[PDB]
Design a protein around this ligand. Structure first.
Ligand SMILES: NC(=O)C1=CN([C@@H]2O[C@H](COP(=O)(O)OP(=O)(O)OC[C@H]3O[C@@H](n4cnc5c(N)ncnc54)[C@H](OP(=O)(O)O)[C@@H]3O)[C@@H](O)[C@H]2O)C=CC1
Ligand SMILES: NC(=O)C1=CN([C@@H]2O[C@H](COP(=O)(O)OP(=O)(O)OC[C@H]3O[C@@H](n4cnc5c(N)ncnc54)[C@H](OP(=O)(O)O)[C@@H]3O)[C@@H](O)[C@H]2O)C=CC1
Ligand SMILES: O=P(O)(O)OC[C@H]1O[C@@H](O)[C@H](O)[C@@H](O)[C@@H]1O
Ligand SMILES: O=P(O)(O)OC[C@H]1O[C@@H](O)[C@H](O)[C@@H](O)[C@@H]1O
Ligand SMILES: [Ca+2]
Ligand SMILES: [Ca+2]
Lengths: 485, 485
């Protein structure tokens, strides 16, 4: 394979994320022969640990992925550590030492990635000092991987963007969105543009409505403290949902380079309508899970760290509208919630029913292209065919495909993808500023109404697919949710 | 169900066909509650048999379909017989007696079907006398079911049509084509017109080529005597293949009535090009099966009743061209042979590869809509998607659907369909004169070259999918056979 010559500095290199996802993902890239000799990993955090102590943390991190110990050790030799506080301008010279030390040790000509696996409050600070204290490579490239969340509103997001642009150009900024890193999500473009029958049908003339569903069976359980101010709206809608919707709504690009892809996606984002109070109440539904049937499924209000009077949303459902010629009048439905019927991340393209009359008792119904992303990748197509009856009549049948075990096992985890992409300088599977700003602008209009409590808070039985209002939402346009559970 | 009040007269009612297919198919229609009180079946042939003797023939015919004996007997009471020679004008009064006897006995107001399950030489004769000797109902309808083959060339077919039109209008003539009676073949129209994504793509702008395959693993074995002068060309191509091609090539009808359907099909038939000697050699391949690997698979030349110097075709492959705006430049490939790799009656719609460039090592390939008719009904769609690789790349995946056992078991046999349709007066699943004449005109041009031996006779290993020339046929237009065995 072609060797990837890069140097990655992990801010928050002792954290849970670095141990669970980051390091093993890097190890996988090494096992696959991508990272060979010319690469180094510099871990950093406040806590002091000498190289020997750090390497053990790295060793444990990749234990469940180690099959050949000698291979693990060869990899560990590329790791170094330095205790350091990010708010200490002077302490950055220490870090610069380590980085330049590693650069010489493995003969890495520039090419530096700075992964900020730290709390958001440190994002801008770290950036300023990466430039001012001279940590940025003078050759190759310099890329900054920003962890979730990129802001908590448009203002905060915009401020963050300003602090970061002081040291980097937007094309050097790789914000983390793990849903964009999911293999199945990257199939959307291949299915659409790769098959003229679908490419030519990806518009208002053929499609009735589009559906994006991020269903989870888990409750808040653990992280209520943080989740009580974020809700489904910011936790899953603003980031995950909106960026998938962007892959679907995008115009047809001039080519498949991240640049044209982004331009095409932005063409749709700039067309997305932002709602006012009256419209939020019209096109959106916010809900909170109550008890299920089992005692084990207690209401949201009884979860650890949840205020007894919380009006937070554990479920969101809504209709997006793109004022683009190609999507004129096509509803884009999105939903995401906790304590639902099943875990399911899927996209449903519902085509308009044909108008040809067969004379049958059952005329043509809506065809559906379904792309299942989680739990297991699958592609299904509901088509109109003839029923096995004496009198001519139509009926829908479901064509199906599912990933094989060879596919399932060779599929890279989102984090391995994102990192690998950043090293390659490919922004296709990353949201740019324009996408994020609009996603926030859109979500902020909704949040404003909820914060002001000028919209209803529906409820739902823990284990259903949401409040009934979710169904009535679609019914108004004569639509229904494809996935029922 | 709505009662079907009809009276059917079976010419050749002692024959193998009447016993194997005809009678049981009628019994099924009775079991399904369609035929109730007002119906009668008059069997006829030269051989003398009294009612008691005939009913036993009918009883044995439906033995393997009898689960309730009392039900079988109730059905048998509707049968009568009369010995009769079809060339005896005077003996027709006897038959008229039986028919009118049955008509009174079961109170059937007209509605008569005359099934000619006799050798072709008797078709015209029987027709003349049905009219002249007054056997045609004066009320209701009168329909004539003509068994295969309807002619053996255009001239003979045209003569037959003339003799029959002396007593019937073309809309009363129901020629037997059991392939049109196959449930899956009737799905073509539903899939196409019932799904706009396919309906809008059923043209030269989307499709690369169309493929019809009637593959058989059986050799001539039994009927070589008849088969040696018919060959694959007339045995499977002229009738079965051509009429399926008609369901695919047809324009889009004004409605789904047999009239508009036929008009649409004829729009294509009238556009079909007829070849000359040079063109037959260019667009067609004729072959005869040689030995396989196993001794059991002996060459055609060693089959019972096959002349040691026979140049007969046990396999045919060819390219059809429709000079219609919508099919301009779209090849229609057809193939049918004996001693092939597998039994398979399927249709493959190969769509053009998309021209969008992804930059991948593997660009978009041709999508394929496959409709499998025999052995088991299935619908498959080969689509372009993303491969499970690190570097973005496309790959084809196969979506699939297969008939359930509920479908398989509730699906009516071709003969039951054809009869049931004739009683309903529905000609949708029947070739009209226009279709048959053109089918013959097309086949005759080819036969002329073969008879004159001004075209090569290829050969193939018993068990392959044909001679290599079959592959080279498609390769010339940059195509290949979807089904490989
Ligand atoms: O949640 P997690 O425990 O998963 O991780 C938090 C990460 O942030 C790091 N961190 C916190 N504050 C700073 C800081 N001010 N400077 C540098 N690293 C910091 C922590 O390192 P640390 O171990 O220094 O807290 C830790 O690695
Ligand atoms: O092959 P099959 O044996 O399957 O059947 C031939 C059918 O044609 C019938 N048949 C043959 N010639 C005449 C005729 N000239 N008039 C009436 N029926 C006829 C036979 O009846 P039959 O038993 O009279 O030959 C038989 O029922
Ligand atoms: O569906 P996945 O990829 O496991 O992601 C689900 C998780 O996605 C995270 O982004 C959310 O913060 C969590 O609340 C959620 O549970
Ligand atoms: O494929 P099916 O429907 O069994 O039909 C196959 C038969 O069809 C008949 O029409 C041919 O005369 C036979 O030679 C052939 O074997
Ligand atoms: Ca509406
Ligand atoms: Ca050609």
């Amino acid at each position: 394979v072609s060797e990837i010559k890069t140097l990655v500095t992990f801010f928050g290199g002792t954290g849970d994320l670095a141990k669970r996802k980051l390091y093993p993902s890097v190890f996988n890239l090494y096992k696959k022969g991508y990272l060979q000799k010319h690469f180094a990993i510099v871990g950093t955090a406040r806590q002091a640990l000498n190289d020997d102590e750090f390497k053990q943390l790295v060793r444990d991190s990749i234990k469940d992925f180690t099959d050949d110990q000698a291979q693990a050790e060869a990899f560990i030799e590329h790791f170094s550590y330095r205790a350091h506080d990010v708010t200490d301008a002077a302490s950055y010279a220490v870090l610069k030492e380590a980085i330049e030390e590693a650069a010489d040790k493995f003969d890495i000509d520039g090419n530096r990635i700075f992964y900020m696996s730290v709390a958001p409050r440190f994002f801008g600070t770290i950036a300023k000092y990466l430039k001012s204290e001279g940590l940025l490579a003078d050759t190759g490239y310099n890329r900054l991987m920003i962890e979730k969340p990129f802001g908590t509103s448009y203002d905060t997001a915009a401020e963050l963007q300003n602090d970061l642009e002081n040291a980097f150009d937007d094309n050097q900024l790789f914000r983390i969105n793990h849903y964009l890193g999911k293999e199945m999500v990257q199939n959307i473009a291949a299915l659409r543009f790769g098959n003229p029958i679908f490419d030519a049908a990806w518009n208002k003339d053929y499609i009735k409505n589009v559906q994006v569903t991020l269903s989870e069976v888990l409750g808040v359980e653990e992280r209520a403290g943080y989740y009580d101010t974020a809700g489904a709206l910011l936790d899953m809608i603003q980031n995950h949902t909106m960026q998938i919707v962007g892959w679907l709504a995008m115009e047809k690009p001039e080519s498949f380079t991240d640049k044209d892809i982004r331009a095409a996606k932005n063409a749709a984002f700039n067309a997305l309508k932002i709602y006012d109070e009256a419209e939020v109440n019209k096109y959106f539904v916010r809900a909170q899970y109550g008890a299920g049937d089992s005692a084990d499924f207690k209401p949201y209000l009884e979860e650890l760290d949840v205020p007894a009077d919380s009006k937070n949303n554990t479920f969101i459902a809504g209709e997006l509208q793109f004022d683009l010629p190609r999507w004129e009048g096509v509803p884009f439905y999105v939903r995401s919630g906790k304590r639902l019927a099943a875990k399911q991340t899927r996209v449903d393209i519902v085509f308009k029913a044909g108008t040809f009359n067969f004379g049958s008792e059952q005329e043509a119904q809506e065809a559906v292209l379904s792309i299942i992303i989680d739990p297991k990748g699958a592609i299904e197509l509901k088509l109109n065919a003839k029923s096995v009856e004496d009198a001519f009549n139509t009926r829908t049948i479901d064509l199906g495909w599912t990933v094989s075990d060879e596919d399932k096992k060779n599929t890279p985890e989102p984090y391995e993808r994102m990192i690998h992409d950043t090293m390659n300088g490919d922004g296709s599977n990353f949201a740019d500023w324009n996408g994020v700003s609009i996603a926030w602008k859109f979500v902020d209009a909704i949040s404003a109404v909820y914060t002001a409590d000028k919209a209803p808070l529906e409820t739902y039985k823990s284990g259903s697919m949401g409040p009934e209002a979710s169904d009535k939402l679609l019914a108004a346009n004569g639509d229904a949710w494809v996935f029922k559970g």
